RNA sequence: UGACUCUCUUAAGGUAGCCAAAUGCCUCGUCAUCUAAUUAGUGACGCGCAUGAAUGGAUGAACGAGAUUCCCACUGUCCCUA
RNA sequence: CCGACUUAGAACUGGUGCGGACCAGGGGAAUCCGACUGUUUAAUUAAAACAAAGCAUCGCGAAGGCCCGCGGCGGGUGUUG
RNA sequence: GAAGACGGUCGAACUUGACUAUCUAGAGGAAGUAAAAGUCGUAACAAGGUUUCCGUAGGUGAACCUGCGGAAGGAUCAUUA
RNA sequence: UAAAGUUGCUGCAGUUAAAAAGCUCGUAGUUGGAUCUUGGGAGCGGCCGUCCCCUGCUCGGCGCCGGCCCGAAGCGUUUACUUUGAAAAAAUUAGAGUGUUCAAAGCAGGCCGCCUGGAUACCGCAGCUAGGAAUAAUGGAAUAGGACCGCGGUUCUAUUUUGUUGGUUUUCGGAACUGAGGCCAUGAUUAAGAGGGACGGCCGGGGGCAUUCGUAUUGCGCCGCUAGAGGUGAAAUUCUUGGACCGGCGCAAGACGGACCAGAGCGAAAGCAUUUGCCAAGAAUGUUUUCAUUAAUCAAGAACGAAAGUCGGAGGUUCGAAGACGAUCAGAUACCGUCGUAGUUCCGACCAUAAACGAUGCCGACCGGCGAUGCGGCGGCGUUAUUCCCAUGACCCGCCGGGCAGCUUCCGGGAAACCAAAGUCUUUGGGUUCCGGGGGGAGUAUGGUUGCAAAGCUGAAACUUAAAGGAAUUGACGGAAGGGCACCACC
RNA sequence: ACGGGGAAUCAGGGUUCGAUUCCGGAGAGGGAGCCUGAGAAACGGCUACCACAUCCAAGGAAGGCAGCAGGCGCGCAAAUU
């Protein structure tokens, strides 16, 4: 069944720490402990071994991704940014 | 109506009582909330105890007094203002008198010049407040 | 959409009526539609027609005279009684000497007086007069 | 009118009258069979077959020149697709659509017109399972439809 | 009672809140409530000696060997001692 | 044929006695303060004090900010940015 | 074969709690409506002297003012290569 | 209760008077295209109206020579519908007979013992019954488990039979099951000016992502030359010999996408306008493609939803709620002016409201004209470009389909303003949803619910009140626009 | 709100009423339990408890008009022991 209206992962934390900060904690939480598909491998095996490195349980290959995702919104555009200044350089 | 279909009775019935609530004729009296404020209870007359002689202002075009009677019903204990009619009929009525009550004519609203004023007296010790104008019977004292 | 083949036929008859032109097309066919017009006919408020024969719902073109004031549909059918019927034609026919409620009986559509001498009533299917 | 549009476009193929074959086509009813094995064979719909044939070999209607329809003729050979050849696409669109907010979680109009052909599915379904050629347990299933393409 | 007006006057004249509060001298404030009786308690009222906004204001579930008041239950705390 | 711990229900029964010793939360309606857990004057104050997360200011791009040292091409922050 | 008694049974009834409907008190607070002539202004109606109005914000003795976006129920059916 | 067509099934309203959910999706609900039996016979009163017929297979007679008809019973896609028969207390209602002296009533009475009443109709639905077979549902054979045939066989095995005595399988009769072949014209309506889907070339400020440009504005670096600049109804605060404003070069940042830009297009609405790329979507048109009713409208439920607002992160050029000042003023915590906070911008969540308006629900039908326009297609002299033709663009003349609109008129409607939709409405019924019921109180209180909050959705009553309101008319008025006249105006 | 037969108004629809003499149901102050009998959960039968009230020589006894009359109360509202 359905054990929480609207806490989660957050229940843990009982009536402790305010609301608002259980909200935006919860956010993080369901992220940093969420599995992700290993790009390399395709498995949903990419867990968080501690802050910024991720690791495959199947391809044994770790990642340094961000502290509570895989990928970070920043590092995404960087990426995409560098590669559109290395077709330039390289013309 | 609007739907029409050979199968649509319920439609038809269910919308016609839903939409008769905003009618102010039907939610007044099948609402028990108007009964449970009319003063009289549903009753046509009331008897009541006179416990003062209010002399009413009438409304702004037409200026004088309207000599009616803070009226105390036997039944409720609820307090009324009571019109009593015709020129002198008053001096007939003294404080503590079952003088029995009726409505003015619009079924529980205030009548011309009086204001708020929605009964009038009819008898006054069972005695007809017609009888004591005409001058039939004398008030027993 | 099209939900009453017969209503969407007598409405564009009337509406030719009202303006007065010779003859009127009517796109879809039904049965109901040559039975309603038939009956008309017989009562002679229309000149006779001709079913245009399509591989589909056929389409009429009917020669119209200026004798028909109103071709009306009653959607629903109403079933009628003979105990009701006179109830029906009090408040749908001009008077009660010319006007026709046609209604669809077992012994086949049939105007209020046919149905009356068969002693047969039925789903009421529209009126003219 | 249309279905999930405001158009009300009169646009549609118009047959003529006479249904009898036509007085010049060398095609008989059991070589346009085995010219729409030869076709069904190369992985193409009912829809694309009858194109293919009006086109390049003048066979204005299969159900004129044979007895029976493209789909019951595929049908009753066996080379049919399994789910409905319109259903397929509606399906093979959604799949289409939602592959597109992978990436596109902005796109609101794209996640609208994904409910109307969502909708649709689910509607040629309960079309589908009364008619029985879906099964009764068939069920459109956003997670697994990708692979059935 | 004073929305309003007049004058004096500052760097700006205390806003939103809250209150005889752990902050109110007068004071056992005034009203209500709790009592047989309440300088206590709570709820209100604010011209507030001397409330008030990160010198943070107002709230506040959960928590407390924190500070109060009342009720039930209990009882040698007591009647009144053995 | 080997069973090993329970659970529920019933009958009868005792001087209404049975969690029989032992073990083992009084409760409720409210106000004030501090969110909480944590800490504190060893030897009179465990608190409303301190801390705390959250919040917000400030300094500094290293020849720098903050700080140490009698001294130095000294030292801490700093295996730092 | 009487009284009477054990146990069972139906079960009134009082005691306590809980829920529910109805009626009603209340310091204080804050609204509505009705008055023949209270105070302060003039918000609206004429481009009502700042067009009006809508939604949403914040502010102000008071009507109201102002930001943002809409509307014409506008004070323009129109503005010319 | 009628009046009240002011509860509207008959039969009301919803552009502006009260009223169409902001928008679309969507399940119940309601509603759903056309299509399958008609043609003749045979008698009837004067070309004409009428009765009658277009099932099948053991008992008994008008019987007849193992064959023939008529009649009693069991039977046969079904329901709704309609008609019929039944059963359906009286009293009451309707109504027959009837001088209570009339009448309300009563069931009595009437003839010179006799005669005669004390009927009948109605009795919503639901149930029973016998027709009718239009209408509206509904059924069959499509991996033929197919109707109809006799054949081959498998078994439990009536009783018609082997003198009376016993047994067997037997013939024989039903019940269930298989192996065959034969047979019917062997079986599937149509392809909606319903819909979905494929396809073709397109089209569009449709949507998303990245990219790119443009000037302006602001700030800055420097270089000039200088005393003012700025702002206004007039000023002042404000900037300014510490070089302002101005002019010139650069640089930086964040906004915004002018003119072209239209009563033009696109989108469900909200909305959407620099270049180019990428992503999936879409209407319309074209269609001798495909499926074959899959549809319309929709309680509950769901997606989106301007601006403002809220939450966290980045940013903050301009503008700018609040705030500060300068004015104006009697006051001016306003309009005007100078500053300036949140906000305005972006990313990710919340909010769900607007005069979200066309104040006009959606689907379908029909009912005038005209010239345009946008889009697709089709056809038709000729000009122009790639010139070198062919096919294509750009014009030109139409036609067709959808689209935003416009003018026109006694289609018609409407209280009118106005409306080809607001028409096809007392000559009232195409389908369906939402919603109004005099004005206030009030979108209030209360309860529920959603939200961080703001608030959103749902939503009373007491009380009050004779009007509030719509459209149009005439005057009067205007710190509206025009046109006059006058030495009681001016020049 | 006992139901129905019916009643009032009524063009056609309806709308409203039906405690009330006929039919059916229910109940005898509130519940509950029984006895006798073919038939009762009977009340002009019984036994309990509750409410109410009666006579008493204070130990006890006795009660049930929503039967017909009548009284009191309640009331705008209804008859002769």
């Known amino acids: 069944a359905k054990r929480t209206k609207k806490v989660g992962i957050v229940g843990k934390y009982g009536t402790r720490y305010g609301a608002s900060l259980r909200k935006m904690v919860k956010k993080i939480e369901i992220s940093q402990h969420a599995k992700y598909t290993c790009s390399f491998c395709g498995k949903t095996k990419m867990k968080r071994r501690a802050v910024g490195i991720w690791h495959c349980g199947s391809c044994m290959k770790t990642v340094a991704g961000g502290a509570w995702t895989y990928n970070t919104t920043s590092a995404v555009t960087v990426k995409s940014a560098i590669r559109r200044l290395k077709e330039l350089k390289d013309q | ?141 | 959409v099209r939900m009453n083949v017969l209503a969407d036929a007598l409405k564009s008859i009337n509406n030719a009526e009202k303006r007065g032109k010779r003859q009127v097309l009517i796109r879809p066919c039904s049965k109901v539609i040559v039975r309603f017009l038939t009956v008309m006919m017989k009562h002679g408020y229309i000149g006779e027609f001709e079913i245009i024969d399509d591989h589909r719902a056929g389409k009429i073109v009917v020669n119209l005279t200026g004798r028909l004031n109103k071709c009306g549909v009653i959607s629903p059918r109403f079933d009628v009684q003979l105990k009701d019927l006179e109830k029906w034609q009090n408040n749908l026919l001009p008077s009660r000497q010319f006007g026709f409620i046609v209604l669809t009986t077992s012994a086949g559509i049939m105007d209020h007086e046919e149905a009356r001498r068969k002693h047969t009533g039925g789903k009421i299917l529209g009126f003219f007069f | 009118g249309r279905m999930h549009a405001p158009g009300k476009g009169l646009s549609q193929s118009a047959l003529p009258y006479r249904r009898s074959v036509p007085t010049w086509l060398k095609l008989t009813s059991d070589d346009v069979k085995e010219q729409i094995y030869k076709l069904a064979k190369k992985g193409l719909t009912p829809s694309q077959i009858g194109v293919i044939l009006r086109d390049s070999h003048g066979v204005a209607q299969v159900r004129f020149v044979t007895g029976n329809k493209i789909l019951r003729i595929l049908k009753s050979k066996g080379l049919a697709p399994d789910l409905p050849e319109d259903l397929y696409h509606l399906i093979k669109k959604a799949v289409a659509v939602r592959k597109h907010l992978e990436r596109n979680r902005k796109d609101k109009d794209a996640k609208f017109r994904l409910i109307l052909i969502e909708s649709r599915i689910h509607r040629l379904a309960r079309y589908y399972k009364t008619k029985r050629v879906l099964p009764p347990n068939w069920k459109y299933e956003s997670s697994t439809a990708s692979a059935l393409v």
């Open chain 2, 1 to 141: 109506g609007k739907c029409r279909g050979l199968r649509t009775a319920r439609k038809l019935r269910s919308h016609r009582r839903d939409q008769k609530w905003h009618d102010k004729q039907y939610k007044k009296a099948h609402l028990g909330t108007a009964l449970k404020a009319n003063p009289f209870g549903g009753a046509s007359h009331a008897k009541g105890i006179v416990l003062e002689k209010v002399g009413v202002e009438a409304k702004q075009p037409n200026s004088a007094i309207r000599k009616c009677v803070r009226v105390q019903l036997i039944k409720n204990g609820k307090k009324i203002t009571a019109f009593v009619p015709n020129d002198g009929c008053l001096n007939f009525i003294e404080e503590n008198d079952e003088v029995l009550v009726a409505g003015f004519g619009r079924k529980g609203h205030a009548v011309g010049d009086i204001p708020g004023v929605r009964f009038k007296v009819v008898k006054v010790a069972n005695v007809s407040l017609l009888a004591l104008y005409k001058g039939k019977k004398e008030r027993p004292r």
